[PDB]
Ligand binder design. Structure first.
Ligand SMILES: Nc1ncnc2c1ncn2[C@H]1C[C@H](O)[C@@H](COP(=O)(O)O)O1
Ligand SMILES: Nc1ncnc2c1ncn2[C@H]1C[C@H](O)[C@@H](COP(=O)(O)O)O1
Ligand SMILES: Nc1ncnc2c1ncn2[C@H]1C[C@H](O)[C@@H](COP(=O)(O)O)O1
Lengths: 524, 524, 524
């Protein structure tokens, strides 16, 4: 990739091509790149007991396309989800171009901008995965959903290890990575970048809700050939009757005692809250009794971490007054602030579909006897609040969302367990590589006599250009023998003043709701 | 198409090549492209009871060549129409080039402009016809008739469906189209665009007036062998005579009772008005009794729409004091305003030629008895005001004008009827494609710290370049055995201070009159 | 097709195979055939003034598959309609088999049935179309929607011409057709029938609702270059002002006066009624003033015929209190009788979608002046109630329904107009052929001495067997650049006691609602 100054170095492609069981999304967006940290690396750190962290902020920016709406349009996502029991990324190709480097000159009063033709910009992809991976933390920076929205490239920054739960102080293990210590490609207008990636083979995402329920997978018309204890006494009253060993053949209408082959999957109880302000308990944000303490969390090296997405568990409804972590929440259309007090201002996700295989988040997994029953003792009935893997469990994973993550890098650790990103998406060992970009520094007028001191005065600059990502998605059509019509993502937003999923009168594009994927159905 | 900065990317071609029965018009014009809607899409809507509408306005512009004077010169149009009984578009080729992108900087006092070499402009043709077609609504935006007139590219905007006749409110059917969701070609100075199209096979336009009249297509020297009822009585006085059944052989001088094989085509009565202000009735513009109400109109979903061009019908004369819809009216040479009160300030079209086959607009189709005549009853003589298609009808279509439309897209509907654009022109299923163009957004100085908010600050820009359209027209020479000379479009504007059909002393080109096409003659 | 007694002569196939743009439905059903008209042809006739009719009833039965639900399942119809802008029949193959002939013997008290192995049954297809075509009259007899529902084969009967509007008396033109005067194929158990058909090339059915509205097909941002009369006076008051000729440039916000190229299609006013019993007028069924008289109807040879389906016209809503002919009405799920008084007991269809191109059924087409306006006269504003074809009209046709007709035979007449069955469906010149079937007569014990009198005593018999129809449907996927999600047929029947579109607890299958086809959208 290399030509002249007055020659576009690439074209605008915003395809959409469906077929058999392959769909290829292609999209381009214009971007802007500032001069981060005024050209330098800055060591980050701040002791915040549990929020304690340390690291570094770099002068580099980076492209992030880890959000579904970066590739599919509303209509597409609809297509995709109303006719396919699953999908998955297969291949990706990214390309940056039409680089334009600008140098600003703030006048006596206001700023004036001009084209620095010979100025260069750098790009390079960490395809060896030797740098903290940031594109999968569910953070901002991905491309805009709306094709014609210009966006700012995010600043690259990474965290180191926090030794302790007190100080951000760093050990001899903490490491510093320098992006200049990498081979980068230098570009000027007329040059361009391009790269290709191939997704690892990964399981198709569900994209369907279950019909049958795990506890009702038998023939309602027939007896088991298995027997069990029905009751130890004769009455209808606890601890009172002639006392006997009553065994049953386990036949229809019973079912809750039918011997079964599979159990619901692992769960960890979550605290449930109400959207109606006065049904909660009045826990504060800050303080020694901050919400954190009362919400189910994990503990790493003395530090707390909300069990946020957490294990795949059946959740509350999107409409239900109850909600909780485990439920993804996105900003509403009219919500533009770091804070809100009106539930109706936000968007609530829901894993209600999982109630066919997984346990409910706020409830429990089941119950255990708290001791050994006797003729002179009925044991306490304990609560199975958290339960790990056990032979015979099966479960569904969290759904995927139109404005959700697409993939996440699996942690470089010997051993794990069922690698599905908890925020959702595809867990890859080596995922789409992070592409870094940064404007090259331009020394301003220099001293006329030598100085071993590093340069300070730099011309002020910023760049802009387009970028396009093309991902090949493998999808699988359904083919069920279900007779009755299925549920489907439909418009149904009724009459409206300014069409939904479209810019308003002021020219602002905003996403009305969150869209799932599990509309279609498959049995167990 | 791709070369250097100091290298013209195309040349100026304003041909004219006649021959056998093929004529090729080629013309180029310089254009200017602004930054529409300040870069964004805006939802349009306004409840105006009957004028109610909704839609969107885009940041894109578009080339429109759907006007005859965009291609032929006065003299050409003359050539074309004085020797050919018909013509039609055959092929088209368009090309944009010499792109120049400029960035403005308004100084403390006044503006200053400079060349942004690396800035890009986008172009693309919706050749899949997947976008509201606008080029055929008889609106402004086509190229200037005068070769050396710079023009502004029109803003693309489209309307959605209006559900109701009250509110502009939109339903789940209304759709939003985004032009960035298309593959567009990016250009810089030195790049260029080009495309080719081939007109569908379509009937040659008339270009001739009829000699014979539909009701007089027999031999004036001979009797029919058919008989008919002449009169039911004996006198010369209605309802008075000896009463008898008088049949005739239907011979010469009669003719109005001759049995004929064809009837005049469909018509719908139109209200006629006078150019002399006090011969009308004093209907107001606005109000509950707006002109609309009193003028023949159609009704779609409770909304009114003037039956404007309407069915092909014989019209008043261009000089006659009477005029009406059904008659195309263009702005006069000295008329420069959205309004006028002096008929002589405007230009009146006329379908007077159709009086040989079609019914007259303001009159009626014919008459019917309002009941069954009897010896004790003479029925009311009813007025056949509107009549649809009936086996045996034949008719001529509206003429074509030098400054008229050339083609129009036939509506995507199962079924229609005789697809001739009512404003006139060629009805194509897939017509010359709409070519969209828009300047690419250029972020102004950006923030030094990341922000997930879409960019606002953009350098101010506008572009200019040339464009040329070449259309190959198939024409058919006459070959009549008519003996007497034919009528012809002649100059005859007598003496003049500043030659007509030429710029004036001030350098302004203005079109004197409207030119038809039906000067030559063919019989029936 | 011919084998043994203990050898199935065919298998059960109830496929469903989707693909590219071709879908093949295959379905089988079990049937029963009685002995119609006790073996003989009976001349039909009954003078009922306007309901007068004559004809013949035959001893033959016939297979009818002219209903969409005979082939697609709920889910299929859903698939089909949420992803395709159209479809059409391409090829068909039918086959009858597993013939079983039974002979009944009513005992002293009750009946006893036995297998008559050697008894034969006849089948034959009128593929020369030489017999009144009955399969397209929107009558009963088609196969059951539910695969496992046994059905009775319909009796074949046809009507002759009614000369007059008084007597059922027949002329020398009336004709009698005898099915025995055809080559039929005789079968016994072990034999079978089979046949293939290929649909004529026919336009794909719409399957989409329009976005844009016919009267709003321009760019809302630009002026026309055409001028028109705005008002004849100065005030805001009719017949009062300084009186002038006010012409306008016809620019935005106006639109109802914009010169347009196309008009709404033909229409004929229909009377509208209310579902709320006391908003009507109290017209009786029978009588000299029967509803017929007051409802728009046609008149053939003095006989009346409700203009029932009638012309494609925008209709009321399915929920609207107003309804009318022009709207297809089907029996509700709980409606089991020839009569009903509760609108909510039935199912109402709706062509509300056509309001983008067609005129509204109950309203009118538009308005005309009732005379010529003058300075001393403002003409009556007439109502354009019925309007036929007129150059420039365009329109959409009636939708298709899940339980609607599929095709209809075009009448054997020189000339017609836009052959789309008015009840809906595909108008074919030569449609799927009528397959006739009838049990062969079996003489009971006969006289021992000769008699030239035709046989009377026949063993009592009836037959049963399976039949399967396979139709290859050509469908076209969409491919719009619409951005916002589309409307879609979704379940949404909320919670329920007995799942919908599925048998109830009693084992009865009933269709909840009627399903259209126009969920997807295309512009104009
Ligand atoms: N997103 C994703 N990525 C990878 N694997 C997934 C994912 N979702 C479910 N699984 C399953 C597939 C295999 O059973 C498995 C292997 O983990 P391993 O430790 O590699 O033996 O985990
Ligand atoms: N401008 C134009 N375009 C197309 N057809 C025209 C036009 N003017 C007249 N006609 C006639 C030619 C055929 O008779 C016809 C077909 O309409 P169809 O519905 O395609 O059968 O309409
Ligand atoms: N269902 C159906 N069948 C056939 N034609 C249809 C149908 N629907 C619309 N049309 C249109 C297609 C052609 O324009 C036409 C020809 O009628 P013709 O009299 O054959 O010239 O009618």
């Amino acid at each position: 990739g290399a030509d002249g100054v007055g020659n576009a170095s690439g074209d605008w492609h915003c395809d959409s091509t469906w077929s058999e069981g392959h769909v290829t999304t292609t999209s381009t967006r214009t971007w802007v790149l500032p001069t981060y940290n005024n050209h330098l690396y800055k060591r980050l750190g701040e002791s915040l007991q549990s929020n304690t962290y340390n690291g570094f902020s770099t002068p580099w920016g980076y492209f992030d396309f880890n959000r579904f709406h970066c590739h599919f349009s509303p209509r597409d996502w609809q297509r995709l989800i109303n006719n396919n029991w699953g999908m998955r990324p297969k291949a990706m190709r990214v390309k940056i171009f039409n680089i334009q480097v600008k140098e600003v000159t703030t006048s006596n009063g206001e700023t004036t901008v001009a084209n620095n033709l010979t100025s260069t910009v750098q790009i390079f992809a960490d395809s060896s995965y030797e740098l903290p991976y940031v594109m999968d933390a569910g953070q901002e920076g991905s491309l805009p959903p709306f094709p014609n929205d210009v966006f700012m490239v995010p600043q690259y920054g990474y965290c180191g290890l926090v030794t302790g739960n007190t100080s951000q102080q760093q050990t001899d293990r903490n490491a510093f990575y320098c992006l200049e210590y990498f081979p980068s490609q230098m570009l000027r207008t007329g040059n361009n970048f391009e790269i290709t990636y191939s997704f690892e083979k990964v399981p198709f995402h569900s994209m369907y809700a279950h019909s049958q329920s795990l506890d009702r997978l038998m023939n309602p018309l027939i007896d088991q050939y298995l027997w069990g204890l029905q009751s130890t006494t004769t009455g209808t009253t606890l601890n009172a009757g002639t006392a006997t060993t009553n065994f049953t053949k386990l036949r229809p209408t019973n079912f809750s005692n039918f011997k079964k082959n599979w159990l619901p999957g692992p769960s960890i109880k979550q605290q449930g809250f109400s959207k109606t302000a006065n049904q909660n308990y009045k826990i504060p944000a800050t303080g020694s009794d901050s919400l954190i303490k009362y919400e189910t969390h994990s503990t790493l090296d003395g530090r707390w971490s909300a069990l946020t997405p957490g294990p795949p568990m059946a959740t509350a409804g999107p409409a239900d007054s109850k909600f909780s972590n485990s439920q993804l929440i996105f900003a509403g259309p009219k919500q533009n602030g770091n804070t809100a007090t009106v539930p109706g201002t936000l968007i609530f996700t829901s894993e209600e579909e999982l109630a066919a295989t997984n346990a409910t988040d706020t409830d429990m997994w089941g119950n255990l006897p708290g001791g050994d029953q006797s003729n002179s003792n009925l044991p306490t009935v304990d609560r199975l609040t958290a339960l790990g893997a056990v032979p015979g469990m099966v479960w569904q994973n969290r759904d995927i969302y139109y404005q959700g993550p697409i993939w996440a890098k699996i942690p470089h650790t010997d051993g794990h367990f069922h690698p599905s990103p908890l925020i959702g998406g595809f867990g890859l060992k080596h995922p789409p590589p992070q592409i870094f970009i940064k404007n090259t520094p331009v020394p301003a007028n220099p001293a006329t006599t030598f100085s071993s001191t590093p340069v300070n005065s730099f011309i002020t600059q910023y760049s802009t250009g387009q970028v396009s990502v093309q991902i090949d998605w493998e999808i699988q059509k359904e083919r069920s023998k279900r007779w009755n019509p299925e549920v489907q993502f439909t418009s149904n937003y009724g009459q409206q003043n300014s069409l939904l999923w479209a810019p308003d009168a002021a020219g602002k594009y905003t996403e009305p709701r969150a869209i799932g994927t599990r509309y279609l159905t498959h049995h167990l």
